[PDB]
Design a binder for this molecule. Structure first.
Ligand SMILES: CCCCCCCCCCCCCCCC(=O)OC[C@H](CO[C@@H]1O[C@H](CS(=O)(=O)O)[C@@H](O)[C@H](O)[C@H]1O)OC(=O)CCCCCCCCCCCCCCC
Ligand code: SF4
Lengths: 119, 34, 92, 317, 49
């Protein structure tokens, strides 16, 4: 159980959600399991979507549990020139299947947040 | 697709501001007091 | 009346037109209106069978359109990289 | 009296027309916590916006059998399952009104000396009203509560009225009935919510849930379509990391308006609707829905504080 | 009938209005180019207008 905790879409104090996840998949599918929104204001049909690809519209910001993810690819190094070193793509990242005793906290899509004003 | 464009950019909530992703309208409104 | 064959041809045309408009309204159109019945929408997520396959089609189609119809990259990796070496050759 | 940008008026009972420099205004009663009407600015052309709560007509004397936000607090009596002892029928004291501008106004009611110290804060922003409760307790033993708000929203036609955004909650199809939950209704909301039309979901105490019903909800099979949507009662709300449920949204396919119902500090959501025994309560449609913490007892402590706040955003200018 | 279908299937998922419009007008010029290739240009000119 790679226990995950989402800091969702900045709201007043926090906007935390909780989710118990068995590691092994990517971040995209493991989020779309716990039904928490990742693709910002991006709809089903064709907008930025379809997983493991180009556009890069999922920019999850990792705060806690960073030392449990797969290492960064070079597509992440490419599509994230604007990044602070913190966040990654999460559509080409995986959590280890053997890390069933992890503890990871994630803030969802940035550029729609006003935070680090907290803690 | 010609109607995809129209439905995308003329019907909705002005996704810049619709208070699910961005909060830039009213937050500093002093909720329950001391 | 109007030519029956042309009548039926125009009917088929506008049928495909309204079908395209309808799928567009289903996917992108809002829900607060009265033209997204949403009963079916409330069903074609519940028993969506081929979501494991369909999305891959997505993973293809978008990956194409963002790549601008790869023919564009072709002229890049052939022509403007062919002459760039041809000039070097005719220099040496 | 005191007043900066409104008037503490009286019509049958003391009230207040909390207003802002946008047109939106709420008509709060001072006799209780029952807000009566809330008129935001929804559209642009038309001078102002008008999509209020369902405010039933005056009845016996001063009436008040209307509902619409009325905070229903109680005490989970440590004698039986009688979670309906009292609202603490007592006085109500206005205090320390503030505005900070002409686009925000909030009143602070207080009630003490029978139960613990209860404070009630009602706020009006340029867009969104909000209700918050503080339940400061101390004495012999820790006491308990239910802390429910109801907020009977008005909907258009009962045939194109539904809700989006939940899609995932354990949904705990078990309703403790006769007030939604949390008896001591705001002098009226609805009574004896039951279903006798056809086969309704749930064995009246499941957590069938695992919702996975799609984007919409199509709440039409009503007069008992009412179920707490929170986490199950300690079957999963026991261990660590117990999958916090949700935050709400609404839809009405015949008008085109939205009213998000955010909860803060509460635990559940009472999506409940009539549509059966409805021709006795008006014309168009309505439904009672709000947050609370009632699925388990709410032991607070001997010298501690409780918190809870519903916010009605619309984001539909 | 090649450039028609090609311009058509590239307006998909292109999220730039001044770009999707260009893809659409190329997919539309496909129709004129086809109509000229069958002799009945008397309707191709009308479609262009
Ligand atoms: C139905 C079957 C069809 C099969 C295919 C048929 C294709 C026929 C047409 C070929 C494609 C032409 C695309 C032109 C794209 C373009 O203009 O790029 C722009 C670049 C700009 O240069 C570069 O421009 C750069 C700026 S930028 O990158 O362009 O922004 C600049 O930085 C750089 O220094 C500079 O070198 O142009 C070039 O580099 C090369 C120009 C193309 C040269 C073509 C020569 C003639 C070819 C005839 C082929 C005949 C085939 C049959 C023979 C019997
Ligand atoms: S991978 Fe690139 S394209 Fe596929 S979904 Fe994640 S972001 Fe959208």
């Amino acid at each position: 159980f790679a226990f995950v905790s989402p800091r969702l879409l900045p709201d007043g104090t926090p906007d935390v959600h909780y989710r118990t996840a068995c590691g092994g998949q990517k971040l995209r599918d493991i989020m779309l399991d716990a039904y928490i929104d990742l693709y910002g204001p991006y709809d089903k049909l064709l907008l930025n979507c379809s997983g493991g690809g180009e556009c890069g519209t999922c920019i999850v910001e990792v705060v806690e549990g960073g030392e449990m993810l797969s290492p960064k690819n070079e597509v992440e190094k490419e599509k994230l020139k604007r990044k602070p070193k913190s966040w990654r793509l999460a559509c080409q990242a995986t959590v280890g299947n053997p890390d069933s005793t992890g503890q990871m906290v994630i803030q969802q899509l940035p550029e729609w947040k006003v935070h680090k004003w907290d803690k | 697709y010609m109607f995809r464009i129209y439905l995308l950019t003329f019907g909705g909530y002005l996704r810049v501001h619709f208070q699910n992703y961005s909060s830039t309208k009213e937050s500093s409104l002093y909720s329950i007091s001391l | 009346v109007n030519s029956y064959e042309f009548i039926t041809n125009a009917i088929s045309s506008v049928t495909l037109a309204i079908f395209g408009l309808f799928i567009a309204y289903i996917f992108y159109g809002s829900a607060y209106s009265f033209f997204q019945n949403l009963d079916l929408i409330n069903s074609f997520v519940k028993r969506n069978p081929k979501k494991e396959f369909l999305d891959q089609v997505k993973k293809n189609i978008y990956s194409w359109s963002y790549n601008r119809g790869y023919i564009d990259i072709f002229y890049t990796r052939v022509f403007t990289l062919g002459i760039r070496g041809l000039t070097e050759l005719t220099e040496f | 009296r005191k007043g900066l940008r409104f008037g503490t008026d009286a019509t049958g009972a003391p009230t207040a027309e909390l207003s802002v420099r946008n047109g939106s205004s709420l008509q709060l009663r001072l006799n209780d916590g029952l807000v009566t009407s809330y008129r935001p600015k929804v559209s642009w052309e038309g001078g102002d916006g008008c999509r209020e709560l369902l405010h039933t007509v005056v009845g016996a004397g001063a009436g008040a059998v209307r509902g619409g936000v009325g905070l229903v607090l109680n005490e989970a009596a440590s004698s039986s399952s009688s979670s309906s002892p009292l609202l603490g029928a007592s006085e109500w004291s206005v205090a320390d009104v503030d505005s900070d501008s002409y686009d925000a106004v909030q009143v602070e009611l207080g009630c003490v000396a029978s139960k613990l110290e209860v404070s009630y804060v009602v706020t009006l922003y340029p867009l969104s009203m909000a209700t918050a409760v503080i339940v400061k307790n101390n004495g012999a033993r820790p006491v308990e509560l239910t802390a429910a708000v109801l907020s009977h929203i008005k909907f258009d036609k009962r045939r194109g009225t539904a809700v989006e955004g939940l899609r995932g909650c354990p949904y705990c199809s078990h309703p403790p009935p006769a007030s939604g939950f949390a008896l001591l209704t705001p002098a009226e909301a609805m009574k004896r919510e039951e279903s006798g039309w056809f086969g309704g979901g749930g064995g009246e105490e499941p957590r069938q849930g695992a919702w996975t019903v799609e984007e919409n909800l199509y709440t039409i099979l009503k007069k008992k379509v009412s179920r707490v949507y929170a986490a199950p009662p300690e079957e999963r709300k026991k261990r660590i990391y117990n999958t916090a449920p949700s935050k709400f949204t609404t839809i009405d396919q015949s008008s085109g308006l939205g009213f998000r119902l955010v909860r803060m500090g509460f635990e559940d959501m009472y999506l409940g609707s009539p549509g059966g025994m409805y021709d006795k309560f008006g014309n168009d449609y309505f439904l009672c829905t709000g947050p609370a913490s009632i699925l388990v007892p709410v032991v607070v402590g001997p010298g501690e504080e409780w918190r809870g706040a519903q916010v009605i955003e619309h984001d539909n200018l | 009938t090649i450039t028609l279908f090609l311009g058509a299937t590239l307006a998909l998922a292109q999220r730039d209005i001044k770009r999707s419009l260009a893809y659409s007008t190329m997919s539309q010029l496909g129709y004129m180019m086809l109509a000229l290739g069958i002799g009945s240009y008397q309707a191709a000119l009308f479609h262009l207008i």
